[PDB]
Design a protein around this ligand. Structure first.
Ligand SMILES: Nc1ncnc2c1ncn2[C@@H]1O[C@H](COP(=O)(O)OP(=O)(O)OP(=O)(O)O)[C@@H](O)[C@H]1O
Ligand SMILES: Nc1ncnc2c1ncn2[C@@H]1O[C@H](COP(=O)(O)OP(=O)(O)O)[C@@H](O)[C@H]1O
Ligand SMILES: Nc1ncnc2c1ncn2[C@@H]1O[C@H](COP(=O)(O)OP(=O)(O)O)[C@@H](O)[C@H]1O
Ligand SMILES: Nc1ncnc2c1ncn2[C@@H]1O[C@H](COP(=O)(O)OP(=O)(O)O)[C@@H](O)[C@H]1O
Ligand SMILES: [Mg+2]
Lengths: 96, 96, 909, 269, 192, 48
């Protein structure tokens, strides 16, 4: 479980509760994109989780990663599981 | 010249203008072979006196003789079937 | 309650070992058993003490816990138990109010209820409604919600909170409905292979066996239902012939569809009532039992039955065909009945072909005749290998009837409840009697739903089709829960379904619940000595509608010899090819029928008296070539097929008859009397054909190509031998009434180019849906409504064209599969949109002689006036799946194998 | 020669076909009106079921072929009368439910709808007040579409009431497990004791039923499944605003158990 | 029940849920209601099936945090898989609001008032060899609870205390007789 | 004369048949039920 370390890191390095997080499930994707754009503009962080279930969503995610114009101190944190048929393009443009 | 993105809001309208005015067209973020672009990639030219028209969806559109179409791709796989690859010649920029 | 016999005895031996002398004491009460034996006495059953023990046992369990399973095989008396304990308790006890669900037939969201997704509006369900109706009732009631159906965990675990120590039913909205101390759930079932042990530990249980059943105790009540004019002889013959013939069949166990004991008994019995004498009763017993075996065992079944009878018939060779007559007392002579009514007017419809009454067709009719009469309302199912003669013979037996109304429905891998419901509700009245609304056939007496395929619908991931569960509900309870929350009965409906033997893939097996309720038998392939006679008596009149009075043709030994040669060809081709090679090496005698009805198309006039052997034999060889040959993939197999064909034609007459007519092209474009475009209704055998040349066809192609390039894209089409071949083969199939093609080939080669040209040269309208961004299925439905309207109202000859890039949603192949196979598209039109559209067809319906409603005439016009073209790429990945998952997609349309130009022509380009 | 049996059964059904009437009962709503509402439905419906199964018993007689034509009459007659009664009881229950809610908090876009339904129901019930013979509903002026349209308009005013239901569910917390069907009863029938004893069980799981005082203005005790009875330490004033005495039930139950525990432990130590 | 009570009370001290599990037919479902009986709460036993909406679970959660009742979410295993994922965020929000002693939580837009004497539990089986179609729970969502083993109950102690409570006097002999009958009959007779 | 009728009344007389009004006015019963307009569906169609 990485979530507690991320929470403690967000409490340490930042203050005022800038940390925002959304899990991926039935009916959360279209607000996930809105929160992605809004926290890209604000410069605050964003933690998506469980990107191994929504496998036919990730082309929209990589399109929006290619398109957006972020600010400084923005940090996008992902969390996925080992899964065949994954998409290479965001695997290219990420640490692992 | 006009250059357009794949997941773009004004795709078919700008495609109609590029077929009519005789532009040279470049498409950015192609994820494969679109369903729309099959008779235009083939030769489907019904004559109206001296000119020729070509089918794009529902409209009937004049095929200008200055029509040149290029399109880019960001991932070697996706996407060709074995039907839209015997008409489209494929070029792979690669680091060697 | 749980035990068998011997395990209960060993459990008693264990109870003795833990407690030394405190062994036994029995059931305390008996005054309910008096009422129970009274109710058995009322309903004319028998009285068996075992049923009494089980019913008292059930009352004990129902007082004890909340839910009871009644495990048992098919037909072995597990529903009559609660069915009679109902009345036996209700004569003294308060009120037993029965609600009967069947949980697999209807979908889940109607059964347990569900929510409208966008509105947030709770739709009620069936047993939520039943739960409200029981918790309305006052304290002096009792109710038994009964789920007479099979068991899957993903719905039966939804009742864990009901069958709990707690007593509560919950809605997904949060609404929670309790239950008092009254209610019981009774779950009649088949087995518990697929239930998790939470439910198995959660509810009570009753076991039944195949040792407790008494066969004689069911023979006696059937004998008591006999009209006292034959019962002496029937009991005297049953009591010493029945048990031997039953136990020998249970010893062999080579029976083709699996039934229980009760099913074998009823199949033995329902071919008997009305026997006169001993020798007739033997044959009725044989036709009762041996229908479920196969031919390796039926023969020695007949041998042992006749040998352990009185005597042997004169049918000592092939004893399957003994014809007992009441008139003389004759036992057996198999006689062939030849018709002599033979013109070309019989063959006008593609269906209603003249049935040649061979002895096997007489055996089939002698099987059918006792069950389709108006005294025995029996549902039954034929078994046959695919393409053998089932539908033709059953339509003949439909035509022998009196006041029926046939309604054939072709089922497939998508057929559900609503499709048969609308096929019923188009031709059936709605009259509102007492005890709920009901359906009754209009203007007839015995409506017959003829279900075409039963193996073919789709299992879920446990093994239970909703279709067969629905038909089980209908054939057991004569009704169904229609939606909008109301039971709806049926009144006068048979179900006579068909199937093939479960050999190939896509053929599921049937449950034993549905099998042992209804009747069945099987039939075999018409063999070679039969098929020579069938196609000799087909080949004589279609020839002798012309040149009947000439030299060699006539004196029908030669007509028989040609048919025998073609049968030899068909047999050796089936000997050298299989279905393990590819998806579509299809070989039934449907091919021989289409083959020998192809010969109407040719100018066989012979007034200019030829050789004349070669002039007709080359015609025969070309038709055989373009039927058999053009579906063989590998080149070496093509050469082997050539060796076969030539070896046949030389073994029949000498040598060198096929020699050199490879340059011939029998095309529409040129024949006798100037084939030559008006004439929009089609001939009954298509436009006639004639001999041509290569270069002359080249000029005809160039003329039509100029005229095409006038109003289209100007085409730079080259010419080589293979394009001439391909355009000839497309013409000689698109000039057939109701023809379609599957074009399997590489990409890049011209296929849509040649078919567009032939569609312009025959004046047929060509149509292909032009895809856009927002592809849907609604789009495709509107385009199919357009094409079906034009082709089925305005009598216009239409060519429909679908290619690979347009199948953008995975139900399109299924719609095209249906529209190929039947002639309809199911669930396409509503009911209100058929009368203002088919209203201008009643006039021609009146004048033409076609009867029934207007919709069958509309479907017949679509079957005559619509052509489908499928271009599919060979080495696509999904080609094997989409040739295996739609079986009519290689049974309806001829499949040309276009792949690969020659080495010779790529040099010439 | 058992034709006299079938004739005897038909004379029985004809003797039934003149007698049965209703029980016209004066009922008054919130604003002062008076309509003859109809009770004792099961007494009427069970006779109809007996008559239909009796006709089915007549359908098994071998002499049915000469008397089928009268059986057709009584078949269609009972088939109409059953559906008419089984609709009119729905309409009666839903009208009794939906009178006080639209009476108290009148929003006119709801009011025009419910006034048209009110007119269409009271016009039928006046003609029933005129003639109360039970086969007059078979012979009124096309009541079938009147009944179906009144039912459909009540369904539509339910769909309008969804928003107010969610308001009261956010008001009192326990209501998320009551359906709508009982919740609008408890909102409307704010004084009826039969409603309270029929639906207070599903709200608080402990209380099986309650008592009432001598004027049905206070609740003084509560019961159990086996009949364990505990009195309340103070009477509970019933009123119209339903949360303003359900809150009193919750507080007074907790205070009663709290003081009863103290009294028990005080004597026990 | 010693094991069960101590695990659930420590899990409530840490501000988390409680997930007892094990094979079928033990007593895990009624143990939660027994704890609610001994504590003085009210228990609203549910069922979780069919894959209902995350808003439909959300309104249930709103009811539970406003009233103050223990949702004993029986069969939390068999539920649609992404619904579990969104429910994980919901439960985490509620448990944060509990642990920080918050009076006003916020899910589905509104400011729902959460109650201090609240609580959430589930019960489930492991998806073993014959427990039908059940989907495996997410790892994140498992990290919110506190698992309890409830595998084997006793059989002599319950059977002797019940018979001694029900007026019968000779419980200490006959209870052992019952349990030995169960064990031998399960052990040697043919396994249907 | 046709424009005179279609101005004055709202209908065109002798235009539709009887069979071609129910599969076309069939999607109007819902708004006919909700709006409060009574009588048959054809008067609602003419009013629209
Ligand atoms: N006492 C009896 N004497 C003679 N026959 C009986 C008796 N009781 C039942 N039967 C016969 O047993 C047959 C099957 O009864 P029942 O429907 O209970 O079996 P089943 O196993 O429930 O059927 P299914 O396999 O459809 O569930 C009936 O046709 C009935 O005639
Ligand atoms: N005894 C026969 N005489 C002539 N033709 C026959 C005979 N038996 C079968 N056929 C041919 O075989 C075909 C059988 O079709 P059928 O088996 O009904 O199709 P399906 O298997 O799809 O129901 C018929 O069209 C008929 O031409
Ligand atoms: N025999 C031929 N001679 C000349 N050109 C041909 C021939 N066959 C195909 N073509 C070329 O192929 C193109 C059409 O291909 P098409 O029919 O669309 O392939 P497919 O049938 O696989 O979709 C035309 O432009 C035509 O020039
Ligand atoms: N400690 C106990 N004392 C008495 N009865 C018990 C006990 N534990 C369980 N039971 C009984 O076992 C039955 C099932 O318990 P439950 O919690 O439903 O287990 P499961 O959920 O595994 O079926 C209940 O009827 C309950 O009364
Ligand atoms: Mg049964």
């Amino acid at each position: 479980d990485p979530s507690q370390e991320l929470q403690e890191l967000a409490n340490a390095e930042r203050s005022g509760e800038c940390y925002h997080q959304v899990a991926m499930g039935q009916g959360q994707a279209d607000l996930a994109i809105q929160m992605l754009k809004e926290c890209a503009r604000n410069g605050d962080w964003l933690c998506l989780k469980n990107l191994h279930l929504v496998v036919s969503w990730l082309p929209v995610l990589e399109k929006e990663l290619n398109t957006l114009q972020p600010k400084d101190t923005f940090r996008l944190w992902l969390t996925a599981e080992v899964h065949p048929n994954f998409t290479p393009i965001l695997l290219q443009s990420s640490l692992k | 010249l006009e250059v357009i993105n794949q997941q773009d809001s004004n795709f078919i309208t700008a495609l109609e203008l590029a077929v009519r005015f005789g532009k040279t067209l470049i498409i950015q973020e192609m994820d494969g072979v679109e369903p729309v672009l099959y008779p235009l990639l083939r030769r489907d030219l019904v004559a109206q006196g001296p000119r020729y028209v070509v089918q794009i969806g529902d409209k009937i559109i004049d095929y200008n003789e200055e029509f040149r179409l290029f399109l880019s791709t960001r991932n070697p796989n996706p996407f060709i079937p074995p039907d839209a690859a015997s008409i489209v010649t494929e070029v792979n920029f690669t680091t060697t | 309650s749980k035990f068998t016999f011997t395990d209960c005895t060993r459990f008693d031996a264990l109870i003795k070992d833990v407690f030394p002398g405190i062994e036994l004491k029995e059931v305390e009460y008996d005054e309910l058993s008096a009422a129970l034996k009274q109710v058995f006495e009322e309903a004319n059953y028998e009285i068996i003490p075992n049923q009494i023990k089980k019913a008292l046992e059930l009352y004990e369990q129902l007082c004890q816990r909340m839910g009871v399973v009644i495990v048992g095989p098919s037909g072995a008396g597990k529903s009559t138990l609660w069915r009679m304990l109902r009345a036996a308790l209700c004569k003294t006890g308060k009120v037993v109010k029965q609600y009967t669900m069947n949980p697999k037939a209807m979908p889940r969201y109607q059964l347990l209820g569900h929510i409208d997704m966008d509105t947030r509006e709770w739709s009620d369900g069936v047993l939520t409604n039943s739960a409200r109706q029981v918790v309305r009732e006052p304290q002096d009631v009792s109710s038994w919600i009964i789920c007479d159906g099979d068991i899957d965990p993903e719905w039966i675990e939804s009742l864990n909170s009901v069958l709990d120590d707690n007593r509560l039913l919950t809605m997904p909205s949060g609404e929670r409905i309790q239950f008092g101390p009254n209610v019981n759930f009774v779950f009649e079932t088949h087995d518990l292979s697929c239930a998790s042990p939470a439910t198995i530990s959660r509810m009570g249980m009753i076991f039944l066996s195949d040792e407790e059943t008494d066969l004689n105790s069911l023979i006696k009540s059937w004998l008591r239902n006999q009209p006292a004019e034959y019962r002496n002889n029937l009991e005297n013959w049953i009591g010493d012939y029945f048990e031997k013939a039953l136990q020998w069949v249970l010893k062999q166990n080579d029976y083709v569809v699996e039934t229980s004991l009760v099913g074998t008994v009823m199949n033995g019995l329902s071919h008997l009532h009305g026997c006169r004498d001993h020798d007739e009763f033997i044959i009725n017993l044989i036709r009762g039992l041996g229908g479920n075996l196969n031919m390796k065992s039926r023969l020695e079944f007949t041998k042992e039955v006749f040998h352990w009878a009185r005597e042997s018939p004169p049918d000592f060779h092939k004893p399957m065909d003994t014809y007992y007559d009441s008139t003389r007392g004759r036992l057996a002579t198999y006689v062939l009945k030849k018709p002599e009514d033979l013109t070309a007017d019989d063959f006008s419809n593609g269906l209603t072909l003249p049935v040649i009454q061979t002895p096997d067709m007489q055996r089939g009719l002698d099987y059918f005749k006792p069950w389709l009469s108006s005294d025995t309302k029996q549902p039954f199912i034929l078994v046959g290998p695919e393409g053998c003669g089932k539908g033709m013979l059953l339509r003949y037996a439909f035509s022998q009837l009196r006041s029926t109304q046939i309604a054939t429905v072709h089922c497939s891998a998508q057929t559900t409840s609503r499709h048969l419901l609308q096929k019923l509700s188009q031709t059936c009245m709605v009259i509102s009697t007492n005890t709920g609304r009901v359906y009754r056939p209009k203007d007839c007496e015995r409506l017959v739903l003829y279900l075409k395929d039963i193996n073919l619908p789709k299992l879920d991931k446990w093994g239970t089709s909703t279709l067969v569960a629905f038909l089980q509900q209908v054939l057991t309870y004569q009704g169904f829960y229609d939606e909008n929350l109301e039971w709806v009965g049926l009144e006068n409906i048979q179900i006579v379904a068909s199937m093939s033997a479960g050999g190939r893939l896509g053929r599921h097996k049937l449950t034993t619940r549905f099998t042992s309720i209804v009747r069945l038998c099987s039939i075999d392939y018409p063999e070679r000595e039969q098929l020579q006679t069938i196609y000799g008596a087909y080949l004589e009149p279609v020839l002798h509608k012309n040149l009947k009075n000439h030299s060699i043709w006539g004196s029908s030994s030669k007509i028989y010899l040609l048919a025998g040669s073609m049968v030899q060809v068909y047999e050796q081709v089936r000997a050298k090819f299989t279905v393990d090679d590819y998806s579509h090496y299809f070989f039934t005698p449907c091919i021989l029928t289409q083959w020998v009805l192809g010969l109407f198309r040719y100018d066989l006039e012979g007034g200019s008296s030829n050789h004349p052997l070669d002039y007709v034999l080359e015609i025969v060889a070309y038709e055989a070539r373009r039927l058999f040959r053009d579906k063989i993939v590998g080149a070496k197999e093509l050469h082997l097929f050539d060796i076969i064909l030539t070896s046949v034609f030389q073994g029949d007459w000498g040598s060198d008859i096929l020699d050199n007519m490879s340059d011939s092209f029998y095309v529409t474009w040129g024949a006798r009397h100037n084939s030559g475009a008006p004439g929009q209704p089609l001939p009954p055998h298509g436009k006639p054909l004639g001999k041509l040349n290569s270069t002359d066809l080249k000029d005809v192609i160039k003329k039509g190509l100029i005229h095409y390039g006038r109003d289209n894209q100007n085409l730079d089409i080259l010419l080589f031998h293979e394009v001439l071949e391909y355009m000839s083969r497309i013409d000689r199939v698109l000039s057939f009434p109701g023809g379609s093609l599957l074009l399997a080939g590489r990409s890049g080669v011209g296929r849509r180019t040649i078919t567009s040209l032939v569609s312009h040269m025959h004046g047929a309208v060509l149509f292909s849906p032009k895809i856009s961004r927002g592809y849907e299925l609604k789009q495709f439905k509107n385009d199919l409504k357009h094409v079906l309207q034009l082709a089925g109202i305005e009598a216009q000859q239409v060519v429909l064209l679908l290619e690979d890039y347009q199948f953008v949603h995975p139900t399109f192949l299924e719609m095209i599969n249906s529209l190929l196979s039947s002639g309809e598209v199911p669930g396409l039109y509503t009911l209100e949109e058929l009368e203002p559209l088919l209203l201008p067809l009643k006039d021609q319906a009146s004048q033409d002689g076609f009867f029934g409603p207007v919709f069958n005439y509309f479907t017949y016009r679509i079957q005559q006036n619509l052509h489908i073209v499928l271009i599919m790429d060979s080495a696509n990945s999904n080609f094997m799946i989409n040739c295996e998952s739609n079986p009519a997609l290689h049974k309806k349309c001829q499949v040309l194998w276009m792949e690969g130009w020659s080495n010779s022509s790529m040099k010439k380009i | 020669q058992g034709e006299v049996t079938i004739r005897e059964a038909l004379r029985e059904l004809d003797l039934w076909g003149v007698g049965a009437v209703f029980t016209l009962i004066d009922y008054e709503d919130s604003q002062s009106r008076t309509m003859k509402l109809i009770k004792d439905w099961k007494d009427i419906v069970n006779q109809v079921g007996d008559n239909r199964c009796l006709l089915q018993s007549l359908k098994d007689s071998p002499y049915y072929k000469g008397f089928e034509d009268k059986v057709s009459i009584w078949e269609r007659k009972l088939a109409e009368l059953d559906e008419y009664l089984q609709n009119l009881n729905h309409i009666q229950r839903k009208w009794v439910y939906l009178e006080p809610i639209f009476g108290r908090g009148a929003l006119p876009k709801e009011q025009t709808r419910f006034n048209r339904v009110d007119e269409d129901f009271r016009s039928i019930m006046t003609d029933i007040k005129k003639d109360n013979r039970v086969t007059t509903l078979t012979t009124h002026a096309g009541i079938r579409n009147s009944l179906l349209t009144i039912l459909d308009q009540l369904q539509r005013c339910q769909r309008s009431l969804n928003e107010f239901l969610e308001e009261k569910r956010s008001a009192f917390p326990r209501f998320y497990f009551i359906g709508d069907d009982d919740l609008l009863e408890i909102l409307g029938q704010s004084t009826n004791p039969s409603v309270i004893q029929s639906h207070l069980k599903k709200l608080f799981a402990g209380i099986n039923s309650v008592c009432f005082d001598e004027k049905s203005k206070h609740i003084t005790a509560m019961k159990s499944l086996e009949g364990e009875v505990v009195p309340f330490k103070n009477k509970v004033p019933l009123s119209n605003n339903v949360e303003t005495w359900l809150n009193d039930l919750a507080l007074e139950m907790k205070k009663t158990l709290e003081q009863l525990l103290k009294e028990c432990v005080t004597t026990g130590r | 029940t010693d094991k069960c009570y101590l695990t659930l009370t420590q899990a409530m001290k840490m501000g988390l849920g409680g997930n007892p599990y094990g094979p079928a037919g033990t007593g895990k479902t009624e143990s939660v209601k027994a704890l609610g009986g001994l504590l003085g709460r009210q228990v609203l036993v549910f069922n979780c099936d069919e894959g209902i909406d995350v808003k439909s679970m959300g309104r249930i959660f709103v009811g539970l945090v406003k009233c103050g009742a223990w949702g004993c979410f029986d069969e939390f295993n068999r539920l649609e898989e992404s619904v579990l994922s969104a429910v994980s965020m919901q439960i985490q929000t509620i448990q944060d609001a509990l642990k920080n002693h918050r009076t006003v939580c916020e899910l589905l837009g509104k400011e729902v008032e959460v109650n201090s004497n609240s609580g959430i539990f589930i019960t489930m089986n492991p998806a073993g060899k014959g427990y039908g179609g059940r989907q495996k729970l997410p790892d994140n969502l498992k990290q919110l609870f506190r698992p309890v083993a409830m595998s084997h109950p006793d059989n002599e102690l319950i059977a002797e205390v019940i018979l001694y409570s029900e007026g019968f006097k000779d419980a200490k002999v006959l209870s052992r007789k019952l349990v030995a009958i169960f064990n031998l009959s399960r052990e040697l007779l043919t396994p249907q």
